[PDB]
Subunit: 476 residues, 4 copies
């Protein structure tokens, strides 16, 4: 026997709904991954119909002629309820319509909050007042931003926690669903070869990279209020750091894994400005098309903006495993490439017998693009003398990340979602730096659209212990 | 200023000379790797000329039309001296002819002894008596067999050492010149990633393999007096064990490396018969051609022979690094493939959190064929659940071994040559077992030409701690 | 400015109150360790006065003539309220009397529950209804037993947690306040010398001992319903195991330490009967006085009792640090001595060069009696030959445990108190074994009053890997 | 059956003979430690008799009335032969007298060379010409100095090795016979607790100390030609370093142990002057008696002498175990105390949770005086808060060193004697510094008789990584 589920999309008229949520639920229904009795209920202020949602989402549905019957079966279970986000009568009508569905009283209710955070308090409070199922479970999906600093995020989290349990709150982060990011735990904890070296005695530095080759591309005003740190560092690179640095969990249960992640975060001190390099991209006169416009060339960006589109920060995990190992978090927009990557550079071999010709070993876990795991190491040069040369061992070798995250919410797996204590630790790490940046308005270092970013970032990486050589040559 | 060298080939009328030594010296001269003033002097009882040696060796010379001028310049420096191996007048004529060469008194003398060991004592004694240079160095190349047990090898080694210093004796082993075998030291000692796990705390077992797909192929009588242990185990697999197990040398000087090798050998106890599996191949009735003949089907093999063409022995290195780790030496003829390989199987990960789905990590160093280094490890299965699957990191990417060994003798590098103490340790490890085999004449386990050998070998490997799974699937 | 405190002793007419709680609070007041404004309020059904409590407790007060003025100042702040444990009017009178005290509305209320657990639900529920301070904090001290199995303890813990937060509940364990037990964390985590060896690669087995030289001594009927496992193993030895085995906490905050303890407990599987040895002491005919009576010789013990007065169980911590290391928990009554002790026996040295003369190293942390830390190790025998002999490095060198525990409740430090999740993990480890014991009624192995207990316990320790030698000689 | 032995003392008229060698052989004969058939033969230019040797040595014999019969039995086996050290007739008479003894042709001959090194070449050459036994073994005991630099020591060693095998040469060092020095190997290699931490990952620095509280005390002229480095550092502290730093030998055979020692020495680079602090003691005006005279106050010391009576040098063992760990060698005369000591200071604990209150662990092996092994570590302060305090684990608990060294020469054990390669490595480490000192004549830093020496030595120790605290309080 299988229970019925109601997927309540609140804010279904928004861009996020039609472009990502409705197509994702459609793909999950197409492959039979959803529970059989799944009803999708929209909820927004705009007066639309299921026909309107179909019309605005089918270009993103990737709907091919073959499964048109399944398409019209999908919107058969779809429905819409118009109402306001702070009007109790609208929530009463929403609850009645959910109860008007087949087996709507014992159904599991999954609320996806595709709304700006400005209405999150009211939406969550009203959902807890009137739209909570008395038999099935009730889980809410919350989207970023989760506040802008420690205080505002703490306010929002305390409000949501005052109504919902931690097992009901799913703060969705699309990177925690990516294949390499989830493979990190198997790589670290299923293998003997990576166990004894994964510590400060063998690792010189850890580099976590998130590069984008495109700038703000028109919507620079929305980016201006947050900046690169809040946008990327505070969530993506910090989750990456937690996965890289965490102790082995007692089990693969979500609670144990998130316990280990928050335990790592609690061992990190607040970031100091001397360990931070900020940059803001400028236009490329030799660039072609969109690369010629700088961050300030966007009309929506306020004039004189000091918002950083690039950041390189050094964190330290002050515990037994990691003491003294710099964790370099590097992210930026309008850079030379797209790349999300974990790099461990190992210490020199103690007692070198090859006359300083050896290079530091490196383990690279490239999350994207073209997922790869390779370790740069030394091998004998084919020849006559005893000279090592750099080589590498390369790892050789379905629903996407968002689909699997939604499936996880369906199955109640919370390992790939940000816990409240994890969020608060993340905000406390970066809040003094964010306040200093907002207060002093330091001028970011300009860098040209399509470059690697400020050179001061490379200087900072070199200063904290990373050594780039440039002698490693690789051919596919 | 460069010194002149005399390459004295004694036994130049033999098969080894014409088929390997003369072509190798030819190839070294062709590429200008030899010293400019190098004279090759043959010496044997048969009355031949340089024309005869050219005629019998040119099919093996791989002489192409282009370098015929260099060919005739090569035999210009060639010469021959007929004489007996125990006649002092013949050695006087050899010395006079060497002195009759240009700068023949201050030349470096390199004596390759391409003779059966039965005359080694007389040849070395006479060389030391009359043909030793008073200005340049004198180095002798000695070929296997180096005795048949501890006592005979000790006799021969004591006689040679009574006349020559260790820096003058080059016991040539063609496997110590192979690329992967020499890459073992760089792989172990130039890389941080292989350092902390290369010990008993992480390695469950070490497997050293030497397989040949062909049998004795006609000359079974010569093999009958030695057997597979003396043929392969006592030198090839034992050198492989020394390279795998040795501590890091103080430097890359030959003396330090061979010191580490003999230090490893001294920590090995004598082999017991319960850790030995012996086999002798039989014919394959479904085989095609030469595979249908068994070891005893060779007319040159004495009837009722119990000579083993296969052996699997377990050794233990009783020291701090390796205590309790079984070293499985596996070699055999007429097997299913050609392969020389080093396999390290690592222990299970302690505190498994993946519900016993993990497989033991393995590091494989395949010396031949198709040199490869790969490590079998666990990675997340592309899917939805948290299941690891077996994968592997693969290493991705000139004069041959004999040429480089001869070049090493020219440059005086002795690290790829068996030292006397190393030879004596090797013989003391295996001599009780060899005496037991010769005394009791145990019947070897038959196995069909072209198979993997006796099943008792797999039982022994499983008993000492190796676990084969068969679930690892690999595709190129 | 310092807040006022009310120490509410409920069940003040009981033996525990007059013999331990009132004297402990008296000694804390004598040395000025309590807050200056501290009022002690008794509460029980028996109609007594402060004079009666003084009369029944002064023999235990250790009151010397010098501080009689402080004695009569102490009972000046003392008061008593008679009432029933489930009568709301009595709790109203208690609350009014607390409010009738000076600054009784903003005072911090500390409820020591010196009552049998049968009334704990009613007492806690009524305290939460009516006697909870609205300004100061409210903390309750709960005494053992904390249930009798997983189910009943879970019932009681869920009821208490339904009214009080974890930061308000103090489950008091007098052993967590002992000096060596608290020194375990400093010894493990403040010292480099004990860090790298505190793992499965170096430790062969861990022995946790709790021996008493006296039997049930008259009150055998009370012991009969619980047994040695519930009495000692489930709390004392398990807390000792958690301290020995835990990972390093993120900090010395109580929450981090108890998180590490519960993380250790979660990695322990349920005990199997084959890893359990049970004993029940019999009388000693050669004993003198009380040693001649067996466990069943007590008239209060039901006839045919199979209650175990001795237990030796082996636990395993299935995690990365401890996998395969047996944890031997050994406790018993009427044994040959009093002793609480932690013993780590280390593995043999790998690659022994002293011809098997070496003994396993041992680290001993004796909690009581005569607190000591010593490590048994090998030293050269004073003589001529190269023979090691066993020696040892000995560690060389205030309010008692209950006083410091009560002070901890005053300061709000919860590190030495059992958390709810820790309690439920402890109960789930032992509950199947306890149910099997109460169901099958296995006959315990008799052992004579004053001996070391059953020999089967020594057999079990030897079987799981501990090796006793008896060659270690020590003189003071 | 036991062989006869001849103890030939050459230079028997010297102070060393009568004061140390004759009494030591007397004590060995008194306790029956020598072989039963042992004959002591003196040899010197001065014309003395056995009565004269008895008269000049009995005050040092410690001869008590009880064993006067054994005394006169001892000189019954004593004899003397007068002769010159370069006259062949004298050695012929010595050989004839040895043959004139009972079983003097098959006796084992033990030559103690109690002569200044100026005659060593002649004495050894003549002994090898005429006084070598043809049946028994022949071993020579050689005393320091073993040259003054690399070249002179190499000359002397090449001369002695040209006549004697390494198994015949016993370069006696009285410190290698001391109890703690020999206990170093058992402490390091018989114990698990000292194994995994004995490396660069755990040890911050190694301090080797040799302090004397007395100056040159009259014979300053003899000290002037050598200095403190040659006197103490080049042998005592370097042997101590080898024992501390060496890898585990394959066995306790002398050859394996000395192989490990020379392997350590080969990994040490030549000392640089910036890692050297030199001092020369001056008189103490507040001193009493001999402490008031400085090094230059000795009339036998040449005026303007720059000879160092104190030295503190830092060495580095560039290998896998020790890379980057400073080895501080500290020795000096006229200091505040007598002390020979090995101190290992360990690194800070990684991830400190005790708010920087922890001190570095230390392992101290005091060779003399009052042999002790103790480890300074952190323990909980008896009190209320979580503060560690420094404490220590103390180790708690026959022929002397020279007697056991002579016995070792009798039994042929060479582990406590300097091998030739070890001597040459020791000289090559210090020779550039010694030549620089002799060439530039740097002025040593004055320090007062009875102090700890120059403060620059403490500055150097602090600079290379040792941290002295002064907060460690110890009471017996
Ligand atoms: N390619 C190979 O066959 C090969 C491979 C690996 C190792 N080896 C080793 O290298 C050595 C060279 O042997 P080989 O292959 O050259 O065999 P071989 O051809 O029989 O010996 C070479 C020459 O030695 C002389 N000779 C043969 N038997 C003799 C005897 N009883 N007394 C004195 N002289 C004798 C002969 O020259 P004269 O008649 O002119 O005197 C013969 O031409 C062997 O010990 C073998 O174990 C050989
Ligand atoms: N020293 C110790 O004995 C000791 C040691 C360790 C742990 N503990 C634990 O601490 C708790 C305190 O027990 P205790 O030693 O004080 O025993 P107790 O003296 O029998 O109990 C204390 C008081 O509780 C009241 N009481 C007793 N039985 C009751 C019942 N059935 N219903 C309601 N009230 C009852 C009585 O006061 P009124 O008659 O005035 O109501 C009695 O004076 C126990 O649960 C025990 O397990 C005690
Ligand atoms: N106790 C110590 O003094 C002591 C301590 C440690 C090491 N050592 C070392 O042990 C060796 C023994 O020296 P020692 O203390 O015995 O000094 P020593 O008494 O001067 O020398 C011993 C004997 O050697 C002979 N001799 C002295 N100078 C000579 C010369 N220039 N040429 C030939 N023969 C000479 C003398 O005997 P004849 O006059 O009869 O020939 C003298 O009695 C020394 O090299 C010293 O470095 C000595």
């Amino acid at each position: 026997q299988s229970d019925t589920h109601i997927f309540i999309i609140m804010g279904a008229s928004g861009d996020l709904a039609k472009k990502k949520i409705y197509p994702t639920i459609w793909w999950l229904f197409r492959d039979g991954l959803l529970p059989e009795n799944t009803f999708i209920v929209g909820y927004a202020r705009s007066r639309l119909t299921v026909a309107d949602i179909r019309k605005q989402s089918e270009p993103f549905f990737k709907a091919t002629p073959e499964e048109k019957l399944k398409l019209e079966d999908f919107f058969a279970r779809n429905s819409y309820v118009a109402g306001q986000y702070d009007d109790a009568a609208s929530y009463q009508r929403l609850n009645s319509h959910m109860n008007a569905l087949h087996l709507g009283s014992q159904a599991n209710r999954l609320f996806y909050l595709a709304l700006p955070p400005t209405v999150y308090e009211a939406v969550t409070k009203n959902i807890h007042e009137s739209c909570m199922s008395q038999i099935g479970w009730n889980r809410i999906i919350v989207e970023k931003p989760f506040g802008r600093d420690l205080q505002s995020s703490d306010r929002l989290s305390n409000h949501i926690s005052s109504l919902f349990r931690e097992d009901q709150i799913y703060r969705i982060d699309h990177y925690l669903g990516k294949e390499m990011v989830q493979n990190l735990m198997v790589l670290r904890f299923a293998n003997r070869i990576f166990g004894p070296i994964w510590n400060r005695d063998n690792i010189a530095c850890v580099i976590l990279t998130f590069k984008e080759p495109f700038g703000t591309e028109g919507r620079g005003g929305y980016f201006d209020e947050f900046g690169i740190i809040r946008d990327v560092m505070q969530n993506h690179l910090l989750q990456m750091l937690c996965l890289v640095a965490m102790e082995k969990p007692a089990s693969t249960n979500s609670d144990d894994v998130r316990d280990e992640k928050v335990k790592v975060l609690k061992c990190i001190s607040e970031v100091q400005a001397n360990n931070v390099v900020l940059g803001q991209y400028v236009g490329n006169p030799d660039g072609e098309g969109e690369a010629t416009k700088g961050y300030l060339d966007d009309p929506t960006v306020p004039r004189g903006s000091t918002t950083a589109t690039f950041a390189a920060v050094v964190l330290y995990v002050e515990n037994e495993r990691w003491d003294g190992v710099p964790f370099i978090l590097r992210c930026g927009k309008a850079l030379n490439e797209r790349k999300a990557e974990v790099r461990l550079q190992f210490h020199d071999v103690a007692g070198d017998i090859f006359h300083q010709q050896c290079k530091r070993n490196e383990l690279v876990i490239r999350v994207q693009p073209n997922e790869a795991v390779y370790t740069k190491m030394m091998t004998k040069k084919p020849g006559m003398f005893f000279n090592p040369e750099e080589s590498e061992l390369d790892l050789t070798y379905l629903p996407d990340a968002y689909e699997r995250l939604i499936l996880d919410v369906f199955c109640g797996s919370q390992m790939h979602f940000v816990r409240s204590d994890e969020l608060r630790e993340a905000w406390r790490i970066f809040t003094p730096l964010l306040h200093q940046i907002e207060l002093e308005k330091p001028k970011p270092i300009p860098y040209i659209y399509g470059s690697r970013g400020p050179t001061e970032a490379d200087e900072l990486m070199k200063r904290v212990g990373f050594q780039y050589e440039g002698t490693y040559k690789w051919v596919n």
